[PDB]
Amino acid sequence: FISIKGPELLTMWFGESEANVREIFDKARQAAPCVLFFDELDSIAKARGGNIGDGGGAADRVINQILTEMDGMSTKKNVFIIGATNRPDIIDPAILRPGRLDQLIYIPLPDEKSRVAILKANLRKSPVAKDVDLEFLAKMTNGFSGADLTEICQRACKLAIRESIESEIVPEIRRDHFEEAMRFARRSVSDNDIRKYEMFAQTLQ
Amino acid sequence: PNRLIVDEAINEDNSVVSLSQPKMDELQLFRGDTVLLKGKKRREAVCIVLSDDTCSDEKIRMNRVVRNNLRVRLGDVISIQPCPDVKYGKRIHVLPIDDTVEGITGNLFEVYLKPYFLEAYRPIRKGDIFLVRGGMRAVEFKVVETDPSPYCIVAPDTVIHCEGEPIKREDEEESLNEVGYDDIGGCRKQLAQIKEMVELPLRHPALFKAIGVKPPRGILLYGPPGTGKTLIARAVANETGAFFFLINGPEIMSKLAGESESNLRKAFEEAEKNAPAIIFIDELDAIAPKREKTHGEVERRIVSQLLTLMDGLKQRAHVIVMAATNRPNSIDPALRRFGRFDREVDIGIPDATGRLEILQIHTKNMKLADDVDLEQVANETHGHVGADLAALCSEAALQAIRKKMDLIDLEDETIDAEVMNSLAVTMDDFRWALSQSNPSALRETVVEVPQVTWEDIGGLEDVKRELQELVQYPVEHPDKFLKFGMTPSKGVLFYGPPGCGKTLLAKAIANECQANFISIKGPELLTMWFGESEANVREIFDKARQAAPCVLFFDELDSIAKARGGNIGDGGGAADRVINQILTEMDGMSTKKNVFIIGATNRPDIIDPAILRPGRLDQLIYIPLPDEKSRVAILKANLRKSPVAKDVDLEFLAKMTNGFSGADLTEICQRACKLAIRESIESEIVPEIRRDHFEEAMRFARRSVSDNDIRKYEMFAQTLQ
Amino acid sequence: VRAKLDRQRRVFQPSPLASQFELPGDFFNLTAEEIKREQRLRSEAVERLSVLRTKAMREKEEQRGLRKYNYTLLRVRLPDGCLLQGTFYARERLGAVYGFVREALQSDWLPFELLASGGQKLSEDENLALNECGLVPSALLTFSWDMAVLEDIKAAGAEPDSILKPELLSAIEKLL
Amino acid sequence: VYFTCPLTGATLRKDQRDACIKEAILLHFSTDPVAASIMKIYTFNKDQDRVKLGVDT
Ligand SMILES: Nc1ncnc2c1ncn2[C@@H]1O[C@H](COP(=O)(O)OP(=O)(O)O)[C@@H](O)[C@H]1O
Ligand SMILES: Nc1ncnc2c1ncn2[C@@H]1O[C@H](COP(=O)(O)OP(=O)(O)O)[C@@H](O)[C@H]1O
């Protein structure tokens, strides 16, 4: 797995060193079988102002080198390229043409049964009391993302740790710590953004 | 029993040693009793025993004068044998050592020996060497005759005699003018770090002889020129007794091909022949500059010879090689690979305390006038290094010499001791020299422990506690963090209105931790952005590690976002070259490096959100405008340094200044101070700040944070809580 | 009602034989056991300077050292080679030491001075406590007659060969 | 450390001080009960601020 994160795509863009894209794809050819993941493909568009920016198009030096290398890569090398973006409305549409990332998958906010699964997975690292009703929490966190459920898990953990330390101046996270965490935790994706994401996915059918 | 390990002394007096009180209790001796110390080569010394709160139970603290008389060095062992039978002396004959009395003549008794022993009751033994300072000269004397033997206590009734030629020093005895640890002022920690790295492989090499793991072979000292890099290397060699072999770039580089390599490898051969030995290579960046910067045969060939000689140290047992450079990145990277020069120490720039210590060292021989205050000098000499403080003391001495020598009119081959004894250096001569001196380290970043303490910050009682907990809890309860799978945070972001104490909070926690404070301001982040030199961010984080324990404070995180518009906006977004490198470096910092990273912004809505992702500034503290009781505390803190009349009602001011920040309350205080000064000057051509001065100040002082700006911060604070 | 602290005034005579001792050469050879404690303290000293710790943690280290002593045993070295010793509370005033010495002197009316172990003069008129003077939990004081009377003693040819009363000297003990 | 008992003249150590003086005060009741109880009020009670308030009342 080759992890190319936003800051790496931004570093090449900012310094006008898009030639380094060839070395990234060379790693994929030599590391095969491999999965080449380009995270935050819109990081440059956002670094260009995102919602407004300049008057130019979505194409830039880094993505153009990526598109070139993809066209020169055969499926016979056992290399599969995955992208991710949270702002598809500003991504260079060339990446979705045949021969590139032609497949599109929409990943919605998790539903009730998935949010419970996320809370249970995130809490595998800490002792949690049996009084904690994770299904009740999932029912309330209807608009929360998986990243937001993690903050709830960590916030309740922080409270349990603080109380344990103070008791010597406790053995597990109690329901009160999760209910208190719910007083500060917020969804990172607003209702306006949820509708925008759903309407975009609907437009693509 | 009754055998202790020799350590360094704090007391500057040459006739005393310090023991830990429980050992004085076991020996049934009291503070002030005279004891004998048994050293090496069937020698002994007599001294007075005291005690302090810092000596280890199993150590004896004695200075260089006492250690040399016993022919012992730090880490050796001596025996203590009380000698209460010592009697008062009747006549002692003392003569100077020729090596230190040259070019000077006069009545040495009146200048040196008389005030030295005057009501001091120092123990004296035949054959002892002791040091007396004065007249800008360090003169040491040998005792050649004592009426009682072999030792006695000097008394006011003891005859002190001194007739005869100066004595030639024995070749087995070292001069007291040689550099040692007592000649080093600031950077005490770096010296302690070197002690651990150097004493072990040279004193206890057998730990590595049998085991398959080789010791560190090289130590690279770096920092601005004139900070003592060479001084430390020499002092360590002298204190441990190793042979010191001096190498420097220019000496090798000035030679032709063949001659340069011959001299370099000859030094290594001599270091082995005379082992234990320390090889000090100065200006390492001159002998071994970056390869991509040079194409000459000598510049590359001498590096190959050095690399082979360093690797050959596996056979050259008991030899360590030290080197000095200006920066760790100015030398051929091959030298810094495991083995060779794998360990390095940042000497840095002395702070206000270190500068005072350095001045006190250089003035040891100087007769300072009563008006001289070296602490005032140390506070003014910002940006100076030890090389500049040495020049400062010399210039102050020369100014005093000219002023009095023009009146003395002594033209001869020698100088009278009496006229030097009466030559005092006044504060005007130091102030004059300060105006003529120019710091050599004014461009380099100065990192020191800040002077801001918790008493200087009004309000924010809960933030003060939170910052303390973030420091003690990760080490007072590591089992509770591990039990719950929680990683302690290593940084915090402060946000809110300007002028509320964001910087003071970072300094105050550094102060109370006694940690170094590294201040990065907007202009520095902007300089790296504008100049496309974001690579320098790595140097900032590397400084934080070397300065640990330290607080790494990144102020004005929004400086670049605002430079790109902030309220309007150009063609860019939130990310930039500098913040991207900062985020990358943060991910490499471990919680065990004793570095606490603090950020601050006045516009948290336009800072790259990545800074708050897990592993970065995970703690987030809001700093609101002070409330009524806090504003009173702020006014009292701001006025702490000035006289304030009893008619000044600080609560009344706080009640009115509802929208004022802490910085705005300072403007009121400073205006009232200026007005009090103006009135005093007018009356001379009143001694305390009166309510009239504060009421007039209120006519101009205004709140800098509007109601709309307060809501802007509330919206962000409620979003992330 | 509180028991009066008994000064237990004594005069001692040192025995020159206590200072006669010879060490074999191997007595100065540092052992591996001592090297382990010395090397441990070297690493601990660097670790102390290295740690980021708040003042509350620093207090716990200081507090370990601080609170032991509430008494003192003082000794005075006299010009005649005798040692005068007595016991005091740590908060006792310097004036009690003068009185203690005056009661032991052959001539209690003859002006004298007591100097501390560092050469600092202790003035009889300065009502400071022994724990404030640096004379706790033990100290040796230096006795000397006032210079005014020393000039008359020397000018008359009188050797001051007895400092203390024969009443105490008849009970002089050797140091053991 | 040695101490003299002002009521008996006995030589005491640091640990024997209160034991001998308290005994001498309790024995003194056979000669002068008022003087013995006065010594007991000031001597036995470690809290002198309460003794001053008790005596004044
Ligand atoms: N930290 C320090 N403490 C005391 N003296 C110092 C210190 N740093 C420099 N000095 C003084 O400044 C001078 C430094 O010159 P030198 O010995 O050539 O070393 P370097 O040039 O490597 O600093 C010496 O006179 C030294 O005593
Ligand atoms: N909470 C406070 N307590 C006392 N003084 C304050 C406080 N906040 C601000 N000040 C005053 O404002 C001045 C600037 O504070 P500073 O921390 O530099 O602000 P900033 O962090 O916004 O740069 C200080 O000199 C101080 O006197």
Coordinates of C-alpha atoms in Angstrom, one line a residue, chain B residues 33-262:
Chain B
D33 CA 37.4 21.8 62.1
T34 CA 40.7 21.2 60.5
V35 CA 41.2 17.9 58.8
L36 CA 43.9 16.2 56.7
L37 CA 43.2 14.7 53.3
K38 CA 45.2 11.7 52.0
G39 CA 45.9 11.8 48.3
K40 CA 48.1 10.1 45.8
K41 CA 51.9 9.6 45.8
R42 CA 52.1 9.8 49.6
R43 CA 50.9 13.4 49.7
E44 CA 48.4 15.1 52.0
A45 CA 46.7 18.5 52.3
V46 CA 45.2 20.3 55.3
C47 CA 41.9 22.3 55.0
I48 CA 38.8 23.4 56.8
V49 CA 35.6 21.3 56.5
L50 CA 32.2 22.9 55.9
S51 CA 28.8 21.5 54.7
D52 CA 26.0 22.5 52.3
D53 CA 22.6 21.2 51.0
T54 CA 24.0 20.0 47.6
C55 CA 26.9 17.7 48.3
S56 CA 26.2 14.0 47.8
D57 CA 26.7 11.8 50.8
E58 CA 29.6 9.8 49.3
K59 CA 31.5 12.7 47.7
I60 CA 33.9 15.4 48.9
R61 CA 33.7 18.8 47.2
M62 CA 37.1 20.5 46.7
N63 CA 38.4 23.0 44.1
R64 CA 41.3 22.8 41.8
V65 CA 43.8 24.3 44.3
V66 CA 43.1 21.6 46.8
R67 CA 42.9 18.8 44.2
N68 CA 46.3 19.7 42.7
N69 CA 48.0 19.6 46.1
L70 CA 46.7 16.1 46.5
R71 CA 47.6 15.1 42.9
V72 CA 44.0 13.9 42.4
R73 CA 41.4 14.4 39.8
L74 CA 37.6 14.3 39.6
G75 CA 36.3 10.8 40.3
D76 CA 39.3 9.7 42.4
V77 CA 39.0 8.7 46.1
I78 CA 40.7 10.3 49.1
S79 CA 40.7 9.7 52.9
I80 CA 39.6 12.2 55.5
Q81 CA 41.5 12.2 58.8
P82 CA 40.6 14.9 61.3
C83 CA 43.6 16.6 62.9
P84 CA 42.4 18.7 65.9
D85 CA 45.9 18.8 67.3
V86 CA 47.0 21.4 64.7
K87 CA 48.5 24.4 66.5
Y88 CA 48.8 28.1 65.5
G89 CA 51.9 29.0 63.5
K90 CA 54.7 31.3 64.6
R91 CA 56.5 31.9 61.3
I92 CA 55.8 30.8 57.7
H93 CA 58.0 31.5 54.7
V94 CA 56.1 31.8 51.4
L95 CA 57.6 32.5 48.0
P96 CA 55.9 33.0 44.7
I97 CA 56.1 30.7 41.7
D98 CA 58.2 32.1 38.9
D99 CA 55.7 31.0 36.2
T100 CA 53.1 33.5 37.5
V101 CA 55.3 36.4 38.7
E102 CA 56.9 37.9 35.5
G103 CA 57.0 41.6 34.5
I104 CA 55.7 42.6 37.9
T105 CA 57.7 43.7 41.0
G106 CA 57.0 45.2 44.4
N107 CA 56.1 44.2 47.9
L108 CA 54.1 41.0 47.3
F109 CA 53.3 40.6 51.0
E110 CA 51.4 43.9 51.2
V111 CA 49.6 43.3 47.9
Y112 CA 48.8 39.5 48.1
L113 CA 49.8 37.5 51.1
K114 CA 48.8 40.0 53.8
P115 CA 45.1 40.5 52.9
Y116 CA 44.9 36.8 51.9
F117 CA 45.7 35.6 55.4
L118 CA 44.2 38.6 57.2
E119 CA 41.9 37.1 59.9
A120 CA 41.4 34.1 57.6
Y121 CA 42.9 31.4 59.8
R122 CA 43.7 29.3 56.8
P123 CA 45.5 25.9 57.4
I124 CA 48.9 25.9 55.8
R125 CA 51.2 23.0 55.2
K126 CA 54.8 22.9 53.9
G127 CA 54.9 22.3 50.2
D128 CA 51.3 23.5 49.5
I129 CA 50.5 25.7 46.6
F130 CA 47.8 28.3 47.0
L131 CA 46.4 31.1 44.8
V132 CA 46.0 34.8 45.5
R133 CA 44.2 37.0 42.9
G134 CA 44.6 40.7 42.4
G135 CA 46.1 43.5 40.3
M136 CA 44.8 41.8 37.1
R137 CA 47.2 39.0 37.8
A138 CA 46.8 35.5 39.2
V139 CA 49.8 34.7 41.4
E140 CA 50.3 31.4 43.2
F141 CA 52.8 30.8 46.0
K142 CA 54.6 27.8 47.5
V143 CA 55.2 27.3 51.2
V144 CA 58.8 26.6 51.9
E145 CA 59.2 26.8 55.6
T146 CA 57.0 26.4 58.6
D147 CA 58.2 26.9 62.2
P148 CA 55.9 24.1 63.4
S149 CA 55.7 21.1 61.1
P150 CA 54.4 19.9 58.9
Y151 CA 51.3 22.1 59.1
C152 CA 49.7 24.8 61.2
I153 CA 46.9 27.4 61.3
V154 CA 47.9 31.0 60.4
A155 CA 47.0 33.6 63.0
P156 CA 47.2 37.4 63.3
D157 CA 50.3 36.7 65.5
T158 CA 52.0 34.6 62.8
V159 CA 55.1 36.1 61.1
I160 CA 54.7 36.0 57.3
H161 CA 58.1 36.1 55.6
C162 CA 58.9 36.3 51.9
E163 CA 62.5 36.8 50.7
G164 CA 64.3 35.2 47.8
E165 CA 64.0 34.6 44.1
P166 CA 60.7 33.1 42.7
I167 CA 60.6 29.3 42.7
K168 CA 60.8 27.4 39.5
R169 CA 57.7 25.1 39.1
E170 CA 58.2 21.4 39.3
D171 CA 57.5 19.7 35.9
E172 CA 55.1 17.2 37.6
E173 CA 52.8 20.0 38.8
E174 CA 50.3 21.8 36.5
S175 CA 49.8 25.6 36.6
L176 CA 46.6 26.9 38.1
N177 CA 46.1 29.2 35.0
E178 CA 45.3 26.2 32.9
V179 CA 41.6 26.0 31.8
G180 CA 39.4 23.8 33.9
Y181 CA 35.7 23.5 34.7
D182 CA 35.7 26.5 37.0
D183 CA 36.6 28.7 34.0
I184 CA 33.3 27.8 32.2
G185 CA 30.3 30.0 33.0
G186 CA 27.0 29.3 31.2
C187 CA 26.1 26.1 29.3
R188 CA 26.6 24.0 32.5
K189 CA 24.2 21.3 31.2
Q190 CA 26.2 20.8 28.0
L191 CA 29.3 20.3 30.1
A192 CA 27.5 17.7 32.2
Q193 CA 26.3 15.9 29.0
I194 CA 29.9 15.8 27.7
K195 CA 31.1 14.4 31.1
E196 CA 28.9 11.3 30.7
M197 CA 29.9 10.8 27.1
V198 CA 33.6 11.3 27.6
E199 CA 34.5 10.0 31.1
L200 CA 33.0 6.5 30.6
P201 CA 34.9 5.4 27.5
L202 CA 38.2 6.9 28.8
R203 CA 38.0 5.9 32.4
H204 CA 36.1 2.6 32.1
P205 CA 36.9 1.4 28.5
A206 CA 36.7 -2.3 29.7
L207 CA 32.9 -2.1 29.6
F208 CA 33.3 -2.0 25.8
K209 CA 36.6 -4.0 25.5
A210 CA 35.0 -7.4 26.2
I211 CA 31.5 -6.6 24.8
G212 CA 30.9 -6.6 21.0
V213 CA 29.3 -3.1 21.1
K214 CA 31.8 -0.3 20.4
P215 CA 31.6 3.0 22.3
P216 CA 30.8 6.4 20.8
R217 CA 34.0 7.6 19.2
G218 CA 33.2 11.2 18.3
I219 CA 31.4 14.2 19.8
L220 CA 30.5 17.2 17.7
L221 CA 30.1 20.5 19.5
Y222 CA 28.4 23.2 17.6
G223 CA 27.1 26.7 18.0
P224 CA 28.0 30.3 17.2
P225 CA 31.7 31.3 17.3
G226 CA 33.0 32.5 20.7
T227 CA 30.7 30.3 22.8
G228 CA 33.5 28.2 24.4
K229 CA 33.5 25.1 22.1
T230 CA 37.3 25.0 22.3
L231 CA 37.4 26.0 25.9
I232 CA 35.2 23.0 26.9
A233 CA 37.2 20.5 24.9
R234 CA 40.4 21.7 26.6
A235 CA 38.9 21.9 30.1
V236 CA 37.6 18.3 29.8
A237 CA 41.0 17.0 28.7
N238 CA 42.7 18.9 31.6
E239 CA 40.2 17.8 34.2
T240 CA 40.3 14.1 33.2
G241 CA 44.1 14.1 32.6
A242 CA 43.9 13.0 28.9
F243 CA 46.4 14.4 26.5
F244 CA 44.9 17.2 24.4
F245 CA 45.9 17.3 20.7
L246 CA 44.8 20.4 18.9
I247 CA 43.8 20.3 15.2
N248 CA 42.1 23.0 13.2
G249 CA 40.9 23.4 9.6
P250 CA 43.1 26.3 8.5
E251 CA 46.3 24.5 9.8
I252 CA 45.6 21.4 7.7
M253 CA 44.0 23.2 4.7
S254 CA 46.9 25.6 4.3
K255 CA 49.2 22.6 3.6
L256 CA 49.8 21.0 0.2
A257 CA 48.5 17.6 -0.8
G258 CA 50.4 14.9 1.2
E259 CA 51.5 17.3 3.9
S260 CA 47.9 17.8 5.0
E261 CA 47.1 14.1 5.3
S262 CA 50.5 13.4 7.0

